[PDB]
Amino acid sequence: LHHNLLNKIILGPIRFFDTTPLGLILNRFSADTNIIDQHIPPTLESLTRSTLLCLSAIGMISYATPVFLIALAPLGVAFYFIQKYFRVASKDLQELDDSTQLPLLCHFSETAEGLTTIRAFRHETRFKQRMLELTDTNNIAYLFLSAANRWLEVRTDYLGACIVLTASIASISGSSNSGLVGLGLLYALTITN
Amino acid sequence: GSSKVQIHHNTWLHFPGHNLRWILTFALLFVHVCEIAEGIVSDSQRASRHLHLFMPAVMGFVATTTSIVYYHNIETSNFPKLLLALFLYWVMAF
Amino acid sequence: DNMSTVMRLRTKMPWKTCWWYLTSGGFFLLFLMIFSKLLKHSVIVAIDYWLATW
Amino acid sequence: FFMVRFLQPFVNLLSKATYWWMNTLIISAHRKP
Amino acid sequence: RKPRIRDRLPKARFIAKSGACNLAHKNIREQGRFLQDIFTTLVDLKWRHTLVIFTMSFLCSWLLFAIMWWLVAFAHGDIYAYMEKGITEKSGLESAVCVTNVRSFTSAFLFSIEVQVTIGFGGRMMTEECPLAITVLILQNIVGLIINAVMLGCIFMKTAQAHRRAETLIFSRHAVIAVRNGKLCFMFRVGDLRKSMIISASVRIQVVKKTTTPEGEVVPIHQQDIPVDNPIESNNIFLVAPLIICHVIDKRSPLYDISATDLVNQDLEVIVILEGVVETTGITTQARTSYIAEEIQWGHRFVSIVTEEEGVYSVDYSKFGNTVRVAAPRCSARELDEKPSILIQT
Amino acid sequence: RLPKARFIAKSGACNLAHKNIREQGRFLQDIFTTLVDLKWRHTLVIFTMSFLCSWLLFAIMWWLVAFAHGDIYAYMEKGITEKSGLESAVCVTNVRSFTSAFLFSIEVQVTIGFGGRMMTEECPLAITVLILQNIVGLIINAVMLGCIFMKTAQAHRRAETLIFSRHAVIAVRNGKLCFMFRVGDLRKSMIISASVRIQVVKKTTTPEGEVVPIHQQDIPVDNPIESNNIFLVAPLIICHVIDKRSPLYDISATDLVNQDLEVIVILEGVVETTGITTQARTSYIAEEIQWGHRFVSIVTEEEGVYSVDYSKFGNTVRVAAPRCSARELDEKPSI
Amino acid sequence: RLPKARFIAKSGACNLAHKNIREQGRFLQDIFTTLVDLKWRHTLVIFTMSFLCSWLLFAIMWWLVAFAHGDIYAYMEKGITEKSGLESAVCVTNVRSFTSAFLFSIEVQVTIGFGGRMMTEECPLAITVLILQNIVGLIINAVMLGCIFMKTAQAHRRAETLIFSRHAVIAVRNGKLCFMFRVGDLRKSMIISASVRIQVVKKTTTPEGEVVPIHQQDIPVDNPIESNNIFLVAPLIICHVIDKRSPLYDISATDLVNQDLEVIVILEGVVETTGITTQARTSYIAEEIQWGHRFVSIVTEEEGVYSVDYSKFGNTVRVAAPRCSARELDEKPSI
Numbered sequence A: 001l002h003h004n005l006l007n008k009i010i011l012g013p014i015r016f017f018d019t020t021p022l023g024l025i026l027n028r029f030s031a032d033t034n035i036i037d038q039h040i041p042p043t044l045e046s047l048t049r050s051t052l053l054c055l056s057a058i059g060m061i062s063y064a065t066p067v068f069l070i071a072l073a074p075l076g077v078a079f080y081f082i083q084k085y086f087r088v089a090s091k092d093l094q095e096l097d098d099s100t101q102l103p104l105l106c107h108f109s110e111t112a113e114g115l116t117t118i119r120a121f122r123h124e125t126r127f128k129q130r131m132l133e134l135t136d137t138n139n140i141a142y143l144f145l146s147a148a149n150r151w152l153e154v155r156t157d158y159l160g161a162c163i164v165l166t167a168s169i170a171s172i173s174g175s176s177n178s179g180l181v182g183l184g185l186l187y188a189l190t191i192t193n
Numbered sequence B: 001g002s003s004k005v006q007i008h009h010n011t012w013l014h015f016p017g018h019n020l021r022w023i024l025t026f027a028l029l030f031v032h033v034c035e036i037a038e039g040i041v042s043d044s045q046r047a048s049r050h051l052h053l054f055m056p057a058v059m060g061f062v063a064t065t066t067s068i069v070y071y072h073n074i075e076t077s078n079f080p081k082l083l084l085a086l087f088l089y090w091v092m093a094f
Numbered sequence C: 001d002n003m004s005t006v007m008r009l010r011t012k013m014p015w016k017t018c019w020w021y022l023t024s025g026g027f028f029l030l031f032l033m034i035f036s037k038l039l040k041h042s043v044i045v046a047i048d049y050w051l052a053t054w
Numbered sequence D: 001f002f003m004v005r006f007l008q009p010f011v012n013l014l015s016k017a018t019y020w021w022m023n024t025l026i027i028s029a030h031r032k033p
Numbered sequence E: 001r002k003p004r005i006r007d008r009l010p011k012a013r014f015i016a017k018s019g020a021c022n023l024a025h026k027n028i029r030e031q032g033r034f035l036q037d038i039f040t041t042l043v044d045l046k047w048r049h050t051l052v053i054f055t056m057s058f059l060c061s062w063l064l065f066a067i068m069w070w071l072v073a074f075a076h077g078d079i080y081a082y083m084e085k086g087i088t089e090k091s092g093l094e095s096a097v098c099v100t101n102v103r104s105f106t107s108a109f110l111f112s113i114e115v116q117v118t119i120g121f122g123g124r125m126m127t128e129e130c131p132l133a134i135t136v137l138i139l140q141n142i143v144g145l146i147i148n149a150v151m152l153g154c155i156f157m158k159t160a161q162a163h164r165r166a167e168t169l170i171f172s173r174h175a176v177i178a179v180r181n182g183k184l185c186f187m188f189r190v191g192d193l194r195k196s197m198i199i200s201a202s203v204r205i206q207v208v209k210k211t212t213t214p215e216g217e218v219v220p221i222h223q224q225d226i227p228v229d230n231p232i233e234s235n236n237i238f239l240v241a242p243l244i245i246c247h248v249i250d251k252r253s254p255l256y257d258i259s260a261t262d263l264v265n266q267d268l269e270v271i272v273i274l275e276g277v278v279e280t281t282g283i284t285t286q287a288r289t290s291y292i293a294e295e296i297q298w299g300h301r302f303v304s305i306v307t308e309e310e311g312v313y314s315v316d317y318s319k320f321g322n323t324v325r326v327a328a329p330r331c332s333a334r335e336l337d338e339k340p341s342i343l344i345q346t
Numbered sequence F, G: 001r002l003p004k005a006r007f008i009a010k011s012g013a014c015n016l017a018h019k020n021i022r023e024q025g026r027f028l029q030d031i032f033t034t035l036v037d038l039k040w041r042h043t044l045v046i047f048t049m050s051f052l053c054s055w056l057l058f059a060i061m062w063w064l065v066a067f068a069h070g071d072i073y074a075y076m077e078k079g080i081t082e083k084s085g086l087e088s089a090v091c092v093t094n095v096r097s098f099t100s101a102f103l104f105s106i107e108v109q110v111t112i113g114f115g116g117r118m119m120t121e122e123c124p125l126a127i128t129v130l131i132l133q134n135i136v137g138l139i140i141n142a143v144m145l146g147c148i149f150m151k152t153a154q155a156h157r158r159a160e161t162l163i164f165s166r167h168a169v170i171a172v173r174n175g176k177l178c179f180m181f182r183v184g185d186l187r188k189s190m191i192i193s194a195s196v197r198i199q200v201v202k203k204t205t206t207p208e209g210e211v212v213p214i215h216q217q218d219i220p221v222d223n224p225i226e227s228n229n230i231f232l233v234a235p236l237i238i239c240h241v242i243d244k245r246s247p248l249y250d251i252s253a254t255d256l257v258n259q260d261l262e263v264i265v266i267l268e269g270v271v272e273t274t275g276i277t278t279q280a281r282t283s284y285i286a287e288e289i290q291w292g293h294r295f296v297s298i299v300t301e302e303e304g305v306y307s308v309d310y311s312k313f314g315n316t317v318r319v320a321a322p323r324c325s326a327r328e329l330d331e332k333p334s335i
């Protein structure tokens, strides 16, 4: 990113740069470089490890028990759909959070910034009347964002419970050897989380 | 599915004895689980997978969950005629 | 702003971008990275299988 | 026609948890974000 | 537009650009949802759901009456009479097996299928002993014919409504205001995509605004019509190619007051409702659009979309809302109308 | 005492007698039309009764047929095992009693046809009865399928649910007397190409000495282009300017009380959901018109989207309005 | 030598051509809509093709199905019954051939059911395919039945047959010009609330630069109450006078020989028995109208009753006429 980003914008006209705003360019230089240095690599690494481990555990539990191959069609497909659902829902919620905090802090920037101009402008007490809405106007969105993550976990939790029942039936059904059933049940309990 | 008001803001759960029905039905489901359970234990002891004990019970657990789901749906969507059908069903088991 | 496209682009944007992201960062990811990750995971799975076998 | 003490919150807590308030929005937040 | 950003909710949008009636009714006397309502929902389902409900209904009926038959072949002391393997079936003839050769619930289910869908494999017939079985057979056939008829009616009615695909009537996403033929004119573009014509077409343009009255009353959402300015005063319109439906305003219509600066703060909203019956279907359709103040790009003029090809005219649909900003007078709605001494305020 | 009957009952349903009308008789086409237009609670009964009666009647005929050829007579006197009975000219194998013949019917008509009951070609009477039974079965089946489908098809519509305001208001508007009532909606699909009409019905004479006991005098609904059509998605107030050319000119609040008069309001349109024409009506009588009670606004301004209400539909706040005539209204406009 | 492109071809059938229409798409359900409205030739083949396909497909699902459960072998190796008793595990009794399997297939999806091929309850997959075959058979049967009923429902409406005369005329009635076509009718039932509209299509520049390319004015027709309704039993002559207000007011004796005019006429209305809306369109280009000859009488009072004659539907005779324009004839009395 470092060699390429600088390389792209050095050789250009002042007209466009003075026509489009500077702030967006400064943001593109700072926030995105911070994200890619700090945020994208760990996110990708964590996602790959989690995805691969979930796939590996599902694969293990299906090899160790033949019925799982048929049994595993519906539930994961539903999980696929639910995944996409969250894959958008909370995205929108994050956008909401991304803006919900912009004005309220600036308000506390303002009332303080008017250190003496609003001190005795006779509108001081009415200022709380409006302030007490913004705080709520932000914490309401906060709880909604939290709730979206919670809903995913609850749905995931019930999905995980279903898998366990299946594996348990399969284990009593399998009964190949103690090693096989032990590995299968333990890996199902692992994949639960 | 079939001029319309809010889905759940005001009409969360207004029906007769709403707190009580769920309170009991849960107990019925637990009792059914024990009955299965009892059979589930009993079946190993008996000679050739006799299923009188276990299934009568399995069907009952499934039916009880289904009954509860119909009351909840009948509750969110006001349709008091429905609940009449469920009452006759509760009276054919007694 | 481009609401019709945004609806069409509601999700499933990442693959082309991420591919630009990864390829630049990683050449021969399939064996150097990808291969190492797959080997480690399969090794852990084989550890479990060996524990079952023992 | 044309148209007692038992009060507590355990029952709401026991069978109405973490899946209802945003249920409609979470399934179908399409073009109405 | 940060004020508008915080004013995203404060907005005079009576009908959404899609066409729905964005409103809110409350405090109404909802008598209930009587039974027949559910049946109507059965008619208006989609194919996947209709097929599912169809198959599920048939299978539920079959299984249920199979369970009943199983009980029946139990109580008559029939299953035991068969289970006696002293011979192939030693005393199974005289005992009057209530239903011939019904051995277990699977077999009874095969019999249920065989008796409801009129297959009748003959290997297992009702006999002349048990009246209860005859009662259940009569009940089976009556319920079978009613369910068959109702499901057939459902499938047919989803077939006979295959003419309806979707309403496709297209407006210029924006309005336009200009000067034509010497006076101020209001415009809009209307086009159609369906090959079929629209017979007995008509349009109506209405202004929705909050009004005041000299007597003192205020009507919150006031509607008033406006002429549609055709040559001989008639709300008819022929629609082969798309056109420009211009409701020019003189005095009676509420456009005398319009000032160019005021449009941002303007409270009037234009609504267009047109309707007609489709020639090859027989259904009366009605399409509605909303022209909010933010979408009225004043001063423009519309573009031309008709070209001579080789022997047959060609028409574009890409250039619908594209306009060339022909110069026009400003705020002349009263100035030009209430003619000054020049009588040519433009 | 009994007031002269309104040419229109409040809910509609014009209640007028009809005497000395020559009878048009009846036709069986009418019985069929009565059948199609039933309601479920009787369709699912007449249908079942037709089927059960059909089966029983044909079973009786079958029993007679198996009686004449002596099918029953041969079967009953049976020896040990079976030598005499099977080989002789039975007409319908294995029918030997009523219940058996009943089962044979229920196996023939409804098309089950198991096979224990086979029919041979030795008794022409049996062939004619079979043909007749099958034809009757097909005709009954076809007509009942038609009826059930017709209900499943035309049950996309429901009872006419249109609500007019309870009362009417004589008010002031634009510095003139005016007439107002409210017309709303509870249905879903907006009426298409709706129209409204207002008719004053009162006994009138004619200067050449002739009376007409219930006249009808259409009267103009106010509109900026005089168009009877009207858009409706929220409750409206269908107004009525009053002028010396309009038939209400000669009434003040003092003379309203003991006055013979009426107003009938009929509005019509085609519902698009059911694709079917419909018209609804109301009628206001002399005592039902609260003078001066100008109507109370309903539509408010909620933040994102407007909103309406229905509990306060007929709230009539009252304001000062002249208690005088309309001719005198323009006679003395001084103050 | 090509004709300048005409907006509506002489035989109705508006010949416009708009492209770059955003391809809406090809809805998955569209085949069904196309399927409903086919020539009877096809809906008597797609029926046979669908049935025969489904039968053969389930038969193959079936001959093989008999083989897998051991059915083919028991019968073949020894005698069916002489040497040995049944294996008793036959999935469907006596199902010998991939011919026999096909024959069996006919019973399940056609509801006939002979009996010599029973369904035992051992092989569960057999029960699964029985459920599936029966469901598919019912769905196909219902869809085909609905298609056949739709194409028997639309056997009443056939085609618009409203005949305009070949070309127009232009003559004088009451010292003023006119313009006439000759509408008419063919079948028994009259039209209801039939309406007529005359539109002139022209290229109109504007004194403010704008030039509407193909612009369509509406012009009034003649009637003593200025109402566009009409009621036809014998062909009428719907004039539409030309005056200072009219646009044809600038036509000329020589200029009509090379002119840009397009007088479309549209006629709307329903048909009583079918109760279906309809409309008909046609035209008159510059080449087609020849001045000065009025049409010829039709209705003749025979001895018994009126007679309408078609032998001279479009016959013409010349008559006195001045060659000036509309504004010329009314320009001055002496003019």
Ligand SMILES: Nc1ncnc2c1ncn2[C@@H]1O[C@H](COP(=O)(O)OP(=O)(O)OP(=O)(O)O)[C@@H](O)[C@H]1O
Pocket: E170, E171, E172, E173, E174, E316, E317, E318, E319, E320, E321, E322, G020, G021, G022
């Ligand atoms: N060829 C076409 N195909 C489909 N829709 C069209 C076409 N031309 C115009 N429209 C419709 O007309 C409306 C407004 O079109 P407008 O005159 O604004 O052209 P536009 O600016 O290209 O429209 P948009 O911005 O919606 O693409 C749009 O909603 C669009 O759906």
Ligand SMILES: Nc1ncnc2c1ncn2[C@@H]1O[C@H](COP(=O)(O)OP(=O)(O)OP(=O)(O)O)[C@@H](O)[C@H]1O
Pocket: E027, E028, E029, F163, F164, F165, F166, F167, F309, F310, F311, F312, F313, F314, F315
């Ligand atoms: N909120 C509402 N819900 C349903 N119908 C209403 C409502 N408001 C008015 N109406 C209809 O308008 C008519 C006149 O109603 P009005 O406001 O006079 O109430 P009312 O007649 O005094 O009391 P009620 O409506 O109980 O008879 C009534 O017939 C009613 O059907």
Ligand SMILES: Nc1ncnc2c1ncn2[C@@H]1O[C@H](COP(=O)(O)OP(=O)(O)OP(=O)(O)O)[C@@H](O)[C@H]1O
Pocket: G163, G164, G165, G166, G167, G310, G313, G314, G315
């Ligand atoms: N007997 C008729 N039945 C139906 N249509 C007729 C009849 N006679 C003439 N027409 C109509 O006249 C139109 C043109 O007729 P055609 O040119 O074939 O004969 P023509 O005598 O040359 O013309 P026209 O009959 O108009 O004078 C056609 O649209 C046709 O419908």
Ligand SMILES: [K+]
Pocket: E160, G153
């Ligand atoms: K139809």
